[PDB]
């Protein structure tokens, strides 16, 4: 009944400013954030196949995990994902994509 059991994943930083999560029972490390540590925001973002990162000039690109495609402009799908604070569901739930 581990409903109130502390996670075995802890947070640490490397000399490069990077973060690595350690599992204190299995003794295994990862660069990926385990879904048990993911903050609500991350949980929200984590289901979005489109994610924001910046290029060398600071000009943003948005990448899709399913289709593996890259675009310069923000798709509306991500736009509504950001607005997950006012009108949580933008008239539809993310269970029907027309790509």
């Amino acid at each position: 009944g581990a409903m109130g059991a502390k996670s075995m994943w802890t947070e640490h930083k490397s000399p490069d400013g990077r973060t690595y999560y350690y599992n204190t029972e299995t003794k295994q490390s990862t660069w990926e954030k385990p879904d048990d540590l993911k903050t609500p925001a991350e949980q929200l973002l984590s289901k979005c196949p489109w994610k924001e990162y910046k290029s060398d000039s600071g000009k943003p690109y948005y990448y899709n995990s399913q289709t593996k495609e890259s675009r310069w402009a923000k798709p509306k799908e991500l736009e509504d994902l950001e607005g997950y604070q006012n009108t949580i569901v933008a008239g539809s739930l993310i269970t029907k994509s027309n790509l």
Binding site: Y20, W31, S55, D56, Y63, S70, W72
Partner: peptide
Amino acid sequence: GAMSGSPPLPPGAPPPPPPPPPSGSGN
């Protein structure tokens, strides 16, 4: 080893270089 200090760093690396942006074709 590495029982003192900080625990070990994992194999692999989280995408250091940005995945390819469209260079110009149909975008």
